[PDB]
Enzyme design. Structure first.
Site, PDB file in Angstrom:
ATOM      1  N   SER A   1     -25.543 -29.999  16.364  1.00 44.39           N
ATOM      2  CA  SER A   1     -24.734 -31.256  16.530  1.00 44.39           C
ATOM      3  C   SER A   1     -24.525 -30.107  17.599  1.00 44.39           C
ATOM      4  O   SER A   1     -23.550 -28.704  18.508  1.00 44.39           O
ATOM      5  CB  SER A   1     -24.265 -31.315  15.469  1.00 44.39           C
ATOM      6  OG  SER A   1     -22.825 -32.463  15.950  1.00 44.39           O
TER       7      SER A   1
ATOM      8  N   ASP B   1     -34.581 -34.069  -1.872  1.00 50.57           N
ATOM      9  CA  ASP B   1     -33.593 -32.630  -1.523  1.00 50.57           C
ATOM     10  C   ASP B   1     -34.097 -31.808  -0.501  1.00 50.57           C
ATOM     11  O   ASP B   1     -34.851 -31.355  -0.648  1.00 50.57           O
ATOM     12  CB  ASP B   1     -33.009 -32.228  -2.982  1.00 50.57           C
ATOM     13  CG  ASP B   1     -32.428 -30.361  -2.336  1.00 50.57           C
ATOM     14  OD1 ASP B   1     -31.769 -30.613  -1.280  1.00 50.57           O
ATOM     15  OD2 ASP B   1     -32.295 -29.209  -3.061  1.00 50.57           O
TER      16      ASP B   1
HETATM   17  C1  LIG Z   1     -27.015 -29.531  -8.339  1.00 52.98           C
HETATM   18  C2  LIG Z   1     -26.961 -29.106  -7.562  1.00 52.98           C
HETATM   19  C3  LIG Z   1     -28.092 -29.812  -6.339  1.00 52.98           C
HETATM   20  C4  LIG Z   1     -28.494 -30.943  -6.419  1.00 52.98           C
HETATM   21  C5  LIG Z   1     -28.288 -31.057  -7.464  1.00 52.98           C
HETATM   22  C6  LIG Z   1     -27.073 -30.721  -8.552  1.00 52.98           C
HETATM   23  C7  LIG Z   1     -26.462 -31.940 -10.015  1.00 52.98           C
HETATM   24  N1  LIG Z   1     -25.579 -31.781 -10.049  1.00 52.98           N
HETATM   25  C8  LIG Z   1     -24.358 -32.730  -8.534  1.00 52.98           C
HETATM   26  C9  LIG Z   1     -23.528 -32.878  -8.610  1.00 52.98           C
HETATM   27  C10 LIG Z   1     -23.413 -34.554  -7.581  1.00 52.98           C
HETATM   28  C11 LIG Z   1     -24.325 -34.833  -8.780  1.00 52.98           C
HETATM   29  C12 LIG Z   1     -25.590 -33.778  -8.410  1.00 52.98           C
HETATM   30  O1  LIG Z   1     -29.166 -31.446  -5.860  1.00 52.98           O
HETATM   31  C13 LIG Z   1     -29.221 -29.820  -4.715  1.00 52.98           C
HETATM   32  O2  LIG Z   1     -27.575 -28.728  -5.410  1.00 52.98           O
END
Ligand SMILES: c1cc2c(cc1CNC1CCCC1)OCO2
Length: 330
Positions: free
Chosen positions: A199, A35
């Site tokens: 951008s 992330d």
């Molecule tokens: C929630 C918040 C987040 C994340 C991941 C989640 C988990 N649910 C998401 C919904 C689609 C699949 C993953 O990565 C950064 O912020």
């Protein structure tokens, strides 16, 4: 040193991507969501409230000979969609694709919100934004990239996300076979702790390019592309039957549509997102209303170049003293 790991979509819509990460000794392999929009490495663990664990692989620090409690340290984070998690902290050895960091802060979840519990495929997150956003208290901790950086051949990582297919995260080198043409680099502001850039504009389908500055973040942990309402309206206006639905929570469009491409500017260069990338399928099983992959950022406070945008490019996160971002077509 360098590292190279394959990242794999968690489902048929590319809702997120998971990358295997080795934690502890002997290794415990967990599949983490890399992330670039956050700065905490946190995992489901033996400490996670049992009712909040549903199929995830857990980290058990007591089974790792290299784990050490980081005494007194706690963490708590909330993401842009309202999801959250919190717990305490260990340090341990963490390896990604052959690249090893010793003494990495591994944040052990005691609590996670329902959306994490419900994603059986995501064992935690590995943050790759700037360490200034790390939530560990009272002593803020460094990201995996920040810890690895000085040892890397080059202080960079790259994201090469696939459309309905696996891709690659590389650390410490640029794979010149992984993109076409040249990489265009653009300035980054770290003032908000993000890979924040501007951008130079956009086009819809075969339409003319609109030169306009769009400040946003390169966020591998966000699924969709969130842009100003003006831009998003201009896109969906080219799709017959498309509309913004407050009840669904964004733009939807008839599943029978053929979506136009969307182009975004990176300096004088252009990245084209194929129409198919913008289809997130039926809003509910069997529905003929489909959810759009380009949505307004109006309710968010920042524009987000999430996976929909990034997967159309080979993206360089350059962590030199003055960070920059690079984009190439592929
Ligand atoms: C929630 C918040 C987040 C994340 C991941 C989640 C988990 N649910 C998401 C919904 C689609 C699949 C993953 O990565 C950064 O912020």
């Amino acid at each position: 040193s360098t590292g190279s790991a394959t990242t794999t979509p968690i489902d048929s819509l590319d809702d997120a991507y998971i990358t295997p990460v080795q934690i502890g000794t002997p290794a415990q392999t967990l599949n983490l969501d890399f992330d670039t929009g956050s700065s905490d490495l946190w995992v489901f663990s033996s400490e996670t409230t049992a009712s909040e664990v549903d199929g995830q692989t857990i980290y058990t620090p007591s089974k790792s000979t290299t784990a050490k409690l980081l005494s007194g340290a706690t963490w708590s984070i909330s993401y842009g969609d309202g999801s959250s998690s919190s717990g305490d902290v260990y340090t341990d050895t963490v390896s990604v694709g052959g690249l090893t960091v010793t003494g990495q802060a591994v944040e052990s979840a005691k609590k996670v919100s329902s959306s994490f519990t419900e994603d059986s495929t995501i064992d935690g997150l590995l943050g790759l934004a700037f360490s200034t956003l790390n939530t560990v208290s009272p002593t803020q901790q460094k990201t995996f990239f920040d810890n690895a950086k000085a040892s890397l051949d080059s202080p960079v990582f790259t994201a090469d996300l696939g459309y309905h297919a696996p891709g690659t995260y590389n650390f410490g080198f640029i794979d010149t076979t992984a993109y076409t043409g040249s990489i265009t680099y653009t300035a980054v502001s770290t003032k908000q702790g993000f890979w924040e850039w501007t951008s130079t504009g956009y086009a819809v389908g075969s339409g003319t390019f609109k030169s306009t500055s769009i400040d946003g973040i390169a966020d591998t942990g966000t699924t969709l592309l969130y842009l100003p309402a003006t831009v998003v309206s201009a896109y969906w206006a080219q799709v017959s039957g498309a509309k913004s639905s407050s009840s669904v929570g964004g733009y939807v469009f008839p599943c029978s549509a053929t979506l136009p491409s969307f182009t975004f500017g990176v300096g004088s260069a252009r990245i084209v997102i194929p129409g198919d990338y913008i289809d997130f399928g039926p809003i509910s099983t069997g529905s003929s209303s489909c959810f759009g992959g380009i949505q307004s950022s109006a309710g968010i406070g920042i524009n987000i170049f999430g996976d929909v945008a990034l997967k159309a490019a080979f993206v360089v996160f350059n962590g030199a003293t003055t960070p920059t971002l690079g984009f190439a077509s592929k």
